DNA sequence: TACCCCCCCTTCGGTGCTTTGCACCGAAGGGGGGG
């Protein structure tokens, strides 16, 4: 018995048709159980085919999580209500989360099942739970409530939740909470015992107000940037001199002040590639202002909240990746660098599903966006094994790209 | 009127009216047929008699029932389907045999004028208005709207499907050990209870579908192995594909390969190893699908072979959900894969094939994963788990090739099988130049209106060489550099482009193209023992690479 | 002279980067199959 906010799609728009992909046995037995309480409870109720809309669902375990989380990807039925969650009821962002030397993640989203859902708006959350060899058609459902991973449920609950939250935040003045989509996270400069019993007191505090919580624990100020970096040999070959020039040129489109003429000089002849070639003086000398350039920062790289955020990655070989979060191209807003992931030296696709929620966790905390992520892996392959190592509540937007590492300038 | 079930609401597209189309020139031969059912439908309310308030209409023809006497009636509703609501079809796939598991006792039966069985939703109904032609041009004909889902329209099968969820629901959940495999009106149920038993809960079953006036016919009805199913004959332990026929035509036209093309991909998914490369060579390109072509001599070997596999007849399994699923993969050639997917050796619970050629440039390795891939999404839908893959390439093999890609790439838990052909990688580029090789620092470029160009090199020892190409492009030139520093080497060489191109497409050691030129690099590069390529920006004044591209354009 | 679904094989052309050529992909029309 609340008020149902009302919710309008972008202007010109029509809602998610989105076909539903084959699930595991495992994935829907999960489902199915996790359909039939959330009936029982009127949180949703069965539809038929009149309802043009649909949009994918399936399961997931949380790190270590063991029990089953149900899991809609909204990404469609997000880019179709973005005027709602960013101009009208949006949420700031707080510059002085990735500030804190610890933050944890919390899922609240089981809070989002109080607040009933708009009626008019409750046609765009269908979904279709596929059967095993299709022994039994789709069976089709509606939300009633306030879905788990829809962008408009955190900025509805907004005026609840900052009412739950403001006791804790009088008495803990100077920790910083976040909202983004299922979760809360929470950072405060606390020693790490007093840190873990903040929270347990976030969670009885929250408790009273009619909610659970089924944690992460982040340290962003222990993320390190990765630069661009110069080799060290005591005597160079004409590869090893060719490699370095084509480095330095492709980053001279970020440091302009890289030169390559006397490095070139060295080449001008037609040489055998093992040979030996020692350095001049004016061409150390080159080497070593260029090793300075890039010690320095990027000049006039600044976010710009109005434009998407971008994750490219790059798969280095022996357990390492490597990405870089831009917004116009060759401005990098962070560049990092992973390594010794779950599946290394087993599994690609594992590594990369695990790198991809590393660098939307820390989008979130930094600037409070998930970006789109440039994928090196053929769609296809993707497609196929992503779900079985999917841990997080909330999918990126991504696109596939092949670029062949011509120029390795990102790792040595 | 009356109310069998729960009706379902449609609407139209907003802001459009009915279908206002004239009727066909019917021939009299199917009147006679037509409104010979068509005035039965009235008696039952399935079908209204309307004014001339209703101003809409909508052709109607009739085709005989396949495989019967009797007819069926269908309406052209395309003109309707262009303005009516978009749905979402509830029907994600079909069901295949190699997923059911075995049952004690089974059953099969269609339900009979099943759309008719289905009210219409009231509001809706003045839209089907269409008019009943005569023998003669005087007599006008009663115009009628549908009281239920017409065969025809685009909603009738979502509606039904939808609506039989919701009838068998009830009994589904009073009996959950019942197994009910749901298409359309074709119900397969079956159980672990004594066959007496069974018999008794499939009256049950029948006098609650009749309940919501839904008829069991016993003519459809079918009590005794072997069950018609889906196009299949399953038998307690065993099931495979009704008989499959061949044409025996002497003359080939396109449609005919088409036909031949779709009855053995049908067949491939019980009959191992089915090819159809060489046949679906004949249909690439063509204009009419009337036209003749003959057989080539490798698509005539290819359909005699397909045919002595469907000599012998073969059958599939069941699935044990307690032991394990394997799929075990042959290559064929020519960018051909087949697979088994059994449980138990040497029964197959159902085979198939990959023949898809993704691409301009792949290779062996590249197809088998992206076969995996596929057989892994079928065992998804059809048993919810992928299976172990015994595969016809070496662990080395398949550790060197996902390493070194610089793409992300994997194949689930997998056992090497020493059945050859066995897939390799045919070279592999060094990663650090090759000491005592000669370097070759190529290049190539090409005019764009004269699409004429040079592809040439020079060396650290001082040889040389330059081409002139006719009809070219600046791609083509650099692929022509590397070919000809390939054919003018030793048996192991180092090569320094600047062709982004190029070197992409090397890198991924293709063993196959659609490019001609690039299967001859390929050719090159098996015969090589080591090869370093390297990439260098061009006009940077580096190396041999300024003086190849003075001696290029000139 | 109809409807909906799944599969393969081919054409063709939009998309974006390898660049105004080349490579990739998805919709579509051919066929098979089911009701
Ligand atoms: C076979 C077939 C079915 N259908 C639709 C309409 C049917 O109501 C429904 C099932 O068709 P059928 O099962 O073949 O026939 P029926 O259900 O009308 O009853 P009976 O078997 O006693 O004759 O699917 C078509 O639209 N075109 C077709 O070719
Ligand atoms: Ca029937």
Same mark, same amino acid.
């Given at each position: 018995?609340?008020?149902?906010?009302?919710?309008?799609?972008?202007?010109?728009?029509?809602?998610?048709?989105?076909?539903?992909?084959?699930?595991?046995?495992?994935?829907?037995?999960?489902?199915? @159980?996790?359909?039939?309480?959330?009936?029982?409870?009127?949180?949703?109720?069965?539809?038929?085919?009149?309802?043009?809309?649909?949009?994918?669902?399936?399961?997931?375990?949380?790190?270590?999580?063991?029990?089953? /989380?149900?899991?809609?990807?909204?990404?469609?039925?997000?880019?179709?209500?973005?005027?709602?969650?960013?101009?009208?009821?949006?949420?700031?962002?707080?510059?002085?989360?990735?500030?804190?030397?610890?933050?944890?993640?919390?899922?609240?989203?089981?809070?989002? +099942?109080?607040?009933?859902?708009?009626?008019?708006?409750?046609?765009?959350?269908?979904?279709?739970?596929?059967?095993?060899?299709? @022994?039994?058609?789709?069976?089709?459902?509606?939300?009633?409530?306030?879905?788990?991973?829809?962008?408009?449920?955190?900025?509805?609950?907004?005026?609840?939740?900052?009412?739950?939250?403001?006791?804790?935040?009088?008495?803990?003045?100077?920790?910083?909470?976040?909202?983004?989509?299922?979760?809360?996270?929470?950072?405060?400069?606390?020693?790490?015992?007093?840190?873990?019993?903040?929270?347990?007191?976030?969670?009885?505090?929250?408790?009273?107000?009619?909610?659970?919580?089924?944690?992460? @624990?982040?340290?962003?100020?222990?993320?390190?940037?990765?630069?661009?970096?110069?080799?060290?040999?005591?005597? %160079?070959?004409?590869?090893?001199?060719?490699?370095?020039?084509?480095?330095?040129?492709?980053?001279?489109?970020?440091?302009?002040?890289?030169?390559?003429?006397?490095?070139?000089?060295?080449? /001008?002849?037609?040489?055998?590639?093992?040979?030996?070639?020692?350095?001049?003086?004016?061409?150390?000398?080159?080497?070593?202002?260029?090793?300075?350039?890039?010690?320095?920062?990027?000049?006039?790289?600044?976010?710009?909240?109005?434009?998407?955020?971008?994750?490219?990655?790059?798969?280095?070989?022996?357990?390492?990746?490597?990405?870089?979060?831009?917004?116009?191209? +060759?401005?990098?807003?962070?560049?990092?660098?992973?390594?010794?992931?779950?599946?290394?030296?087993?599994?690609?696709? &594992?590594?990369?599903?695990?790198?991809?929620?590393?660098?939307?966790?820390?989008?979130?905390?930094?600037?409070?966006?998930?970006?789109?992520?440039?994928?090196?892996?053929?769609?296809?392959?993707?497609?196929? %094994?992503?779900?079985?190592?999917?841990?997080?509540?909330?999918?990126?937007?991504?696109?596939?790209?092949?670029?062949?590492?011509?120029?390795?300038?990102?790792?040595? | 009127?009356?109310?069998?079930?729960?009706?379902?609401?449609?609407?139209?597209?907003?802001?459009?009216?009915?279908?206002? !189309?004239?009727?066909?020139?019917?021939?009299?031969?199917?009147?006679?047929?037509?409104?010979?059912?068509?005035?039965?439908?009235?008696?039952?309310?399935?079908?209204?008699?309307?004014?001339?308030?209703?101003?809409?209409?909508?052709?109607?023809?009739?085709?005989?029932?396949?495989?019967?006497?009797?007819?069926?009636?269908?309406?052209?509703?395309?003109?309707?389907? #262009?303005?009516?609501?978009?749905?979402?079809?509830?029907?994600?796939?079909?069901?295949?045999?190699?997923?059911?598991?075995?049952?004690?006792?089974?059953?099969?039966?269609?339900?009979?004028?099943?759309?008719?069985?289905?009210?219409?939703?009231?509001?809706?109904?003045?839209?089907?208005?269409?008019?009943?032609?005569?023998?003669?041009? @005087?007599?006008?004909?009663?115009?009628?709207?549908?009281?239920?889902?017409?065969?025809?329209? *685009?909603?009738?099968?979502?509606?039904?499907?939808?609506?039989?969820?919701?009838?068998?629901?009830?009994?589904?959940?009073?009996?959950?050990?019942?197994?009910?495999?749901?298409?359309?009106?074709?119900?397969?149920?079956?159980?672990?209870?004594?066959?007496?038993?069974?018999?008794?809960?499939?009256?049950?079953? /029948?006098?609650?579908?009749?309940?919501?006036?839904?008829?069991?016919?016993?003519? *459809?009805?079918?009590?005794?192995?072997?069950?018609?199913?889906?196009?299949?004959?399953?038998?307690?332990?065993?099931?495979?594909?009704?008989?499959?026929?061949?044409?025996?035509?002497?003359?080939?036209?396109?449609?005919?390969?088409?036909?031949?093309?779709?009855?053995?991909?049908?067949?491939?998914?019980?009959?191992?190893?089915?090819?159809?490369?060489?046949?679906?060579?004949?249909?690439?390109?063509?204009?009419?699908?009337?036209?003749?072509?003959?057989?080539?001599?490798?698509?005539?070997?290819?359909?005699?072979?397909? /045919?002595?596999?469907?000599?012998?007849?073969?059958?599939?399994?069941?699935?044990?959900?307690?032991?394990?699923?394997?799929?075990?993969?042959?290559?064929?050639?020519?960018?051909?894969?087949?697979?088994?997917?059994?449980?138990?050796?040497?029964?197959?619970?159902?085979?198939?094939?990959?023949?898809?050629?993704?691409?301009?440039?792949?290779?062996?390795?590249?197809?088998?994963?992206?076969?995996?891939?596929?057989?892994?999404?079928?065992?998804?839908?059809?048993?919810?788990?992928?299976?172990?893959?015994?595969?016809?390439?070496?662990?080395?093999?398949?550790?060197?090739?996902?390493?070194?890609?610089?793409?992300?790439?994997?194949?689930?838990?997998?056992?090497?099988?020493?059945?050859?052909?066995?897939?390799?990688?045919?070279?592999?580029?060094?990663?650090?130049?090759?000491?005592?090789?000669?370097?070759?620092?190529?290049?190539?470029? =090409?005019?764009?209106?004269?699409?004429?160009? &040079?592809?040439?090199?020079?060396?650290?020892?001082?040889?040389?060489?330059?081409?002139?190409?006719?009809?070219?492009?600046?791609?083509?030139?650099?692929?022509?550099?590397?070919?000809?520093?390939?054919?003018?080497?030793?048996?192991?060489?180092?090569?320094?482009?600047?062709?982004?191109?190029?070197?992409?497409?090397?890198?991924?050691?293709?063993?196959?193209?659609?490019?001609?030129?690039?299967?001859?690099?390929?050719?090159?590069?098996?015969?090589?023992?080591?090869?370093?390529? =390297?990439?260098?920006?061009?006009? #940077?004044?580096?190396?041999?690479?300024?003086? !190849?591209?003075?001696?290029?354009? =000139?």
């Amino acid at each position: 018995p609340i008020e149902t906010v009302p919710v309008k799609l972008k202007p010109g728009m029509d809602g998610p048709k989105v076909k539903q992909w084959p699930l595991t046995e495992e994935k829907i037995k999960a489902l199915v @159980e996790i359909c039939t309480e959330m009936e029982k409870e009127g949180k949703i109720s069965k539809i038929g085919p009149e309802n043009p809309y649909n949009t994918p669902v399936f399961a997931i375990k949380k790190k270590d999580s063991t029990k089953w /989380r149900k899991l809609v990807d909204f990404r469609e039925l997000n880019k179709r209500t973005q005027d709602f969650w960013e101009v009208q009821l949006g949420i700031p962002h707080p510059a002085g989360l990735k500030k804190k030397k610890s933050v944890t993640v919390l899922d609240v989203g089981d809070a989002y +099942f109080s607040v009933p859902l708009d009626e008019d708006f409750r046609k765009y959350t269908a979904f279709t739970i596929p059967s095993i060899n299709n @022994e039994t058609p789709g069976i089709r459902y509606q939300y009633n409530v306030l879905p788990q991973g829809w962008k408009g449920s955190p900025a509805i609950f907004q005026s609840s939740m900052t009412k739950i939250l403001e006791p804790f935040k009088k008495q803990n003045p100077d920790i910083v909470i976040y909202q983004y989509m299922d979760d809360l996270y929470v950072g405060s400069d606390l020693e790490i015992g007093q840190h873990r019993t903040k929270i347990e007191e976030l969670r009885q505090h929250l408790l009273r107000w009619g909610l659970t919580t089924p944690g992460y @624990e982040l340290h962003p100020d222990k993320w390190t940037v990765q630069p661009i970096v110069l080799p060290e040999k005591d005597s %160079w070959t004409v590869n090893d001199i060719q490699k370095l020039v084509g480095k330095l040129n492709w980053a001279s489109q970020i440091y302009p002040g890289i030169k390559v003429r006397q490095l070139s000089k060295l080449l /001008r002849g037609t040489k055998a590639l093992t040979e030996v070639i020692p350095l001049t003086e004016e061409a150390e000398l080159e080497l070593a202002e260029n090793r300075e350039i890039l010690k320095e920062p990027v000049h006039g790289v600044y976010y710009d909240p109005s434009k998407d955020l971008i994750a490219e990655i790059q798969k280095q070989g022996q357990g390492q990746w490597t990405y870089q979060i831009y917004q116009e191209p +060759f401005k990098n807003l962070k560049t990092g660098k992973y390594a010794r992931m779950r599946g290394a030296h087993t599994n690609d696709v &594992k590594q990369l599903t695990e790198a991809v929620q590393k660098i939307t966790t820390e989008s979130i905390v930094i600037w409070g966006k998930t970006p789109k992520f440039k994928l090196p892996i053929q769609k296809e392959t993707w497609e196929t %094994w992503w779900t079985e190592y999917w841990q997080a509540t909330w999918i990126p937007e991504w696109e596939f790209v092949n670029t062949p590492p011509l120029v390795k300038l990102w790792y040595q | 009127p009356i109310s069998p079930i729960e009706t379902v609401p449609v609407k139209l597209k907003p802001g459009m009216d009915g279908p206002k !189309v004239k009727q066909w020139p019917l021939t009299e031969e199917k009147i006679k047929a037509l409104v010979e059912i068509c005035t039965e439908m009235e008696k039952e309310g399935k079908i209204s008699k309307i004014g001339p308030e209703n101003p809409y209409n909508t052709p109607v023809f009739a085709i005989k029932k396949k495989d019967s006497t009797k007819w069926r009636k269908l309406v052209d509703f395309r003109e309707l389907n #262009k303005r009516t609501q978009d749905f979402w079809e509830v029907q994600l796939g079909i069901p295949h045999p190699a997923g059911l598991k075995k049952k004690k006792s089974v059953t099969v039966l269609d339900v009979g004028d099943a759309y008719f069985s289905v009210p219409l939703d009231e509001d809706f109904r003045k839209y089907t208005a269409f008019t009943i032609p005569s023998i003669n041009n @005087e007599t006008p004909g009663i115009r009628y709207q549908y009281n239920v889902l017409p065969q025809g329209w *685009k909603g009738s099968p979502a509606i039904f499907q939808s609506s039989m969820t919701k009838i068998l629901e009830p009994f589904k959940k009073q009996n959950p050990d019942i197994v009910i495999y749901q298409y359309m009106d074709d119900l397969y149920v079956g159980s672990d209870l004594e066959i007496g038993q069974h018999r008794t809960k499939i009256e049950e079953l /029948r006098q609650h579908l009749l309940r919501w006036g839904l008829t069991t016919p016993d003519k *459809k009805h079918q009590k005794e192995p072997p069950f018609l199913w889906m196009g299949y004959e399953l038998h307690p332990d065993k099931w495979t594909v009704q008989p499959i026929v061949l044409p025996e035509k002497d003359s080939w036209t396109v449609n005919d390969i088409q036909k031949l093309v779709g009855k053995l991909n049908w067949a491939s998914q019980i009959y191992p190893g089915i090819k159809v490369r060489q046949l679906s060579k004949l249909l690439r390109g063509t204009k009419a699908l009337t036209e003749v072509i003959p057989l080539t001599e490798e698509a005539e070997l290819e359909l005699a072979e397909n /045919r002595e596999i469907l000599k012998e007849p073969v059958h599939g399994v069941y699935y044990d959900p307690s032991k394990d699923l394997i799929a075990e993969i042959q290559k064929q050639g020519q960018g051909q894969w087949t697979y088994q997917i059994y449980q138990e050796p040497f029964k197959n619970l159902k085979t198939g094939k990959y023949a898809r050629m993704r691409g301009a440039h792949t290779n062996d390795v590249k197809q088998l994963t992206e076969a995996v891939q596929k057989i892994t999404t079928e065992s998804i839908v059809i048993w919810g788990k992928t299976p172990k893959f015994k595969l016809p390439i070496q662990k080395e093999t398949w550790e060197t090739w996902w390493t070194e890609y610089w793409q992300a790439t994997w194949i689930p838990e997998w056992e090497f099988v020493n059945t050859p052909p066995l897939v390799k990688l045919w070279y592999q580029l060094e990663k650090e130049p090759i000491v005592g090789a000669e370097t070759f620092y190529v290049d190539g470029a =090409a005019n764009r209106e004269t699409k004429l160009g &040079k592809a040439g090199y020079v060396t650290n020892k001082g040889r040389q060489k330059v081409v002139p190409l006719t009809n070219t492009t600046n791609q083509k030139t650099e692929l022509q550099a590397i070919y000809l520093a390939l054919q003018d080497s030793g048996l192991e060489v180092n090569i320094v482009t600047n062709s982004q191109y190029a070197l992409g497409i090397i890198q991924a050691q293709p063993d196959k193209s659609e490019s001609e030129l690039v299967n001859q690099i390929i050719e090159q590069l098996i015969k090589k023992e080591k090869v370093y390529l =390297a990439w260098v920006p061009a006009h #940077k004044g580096i190396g041999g690479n300024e003086q !190849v591209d003075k001696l290029v354009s =000139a």
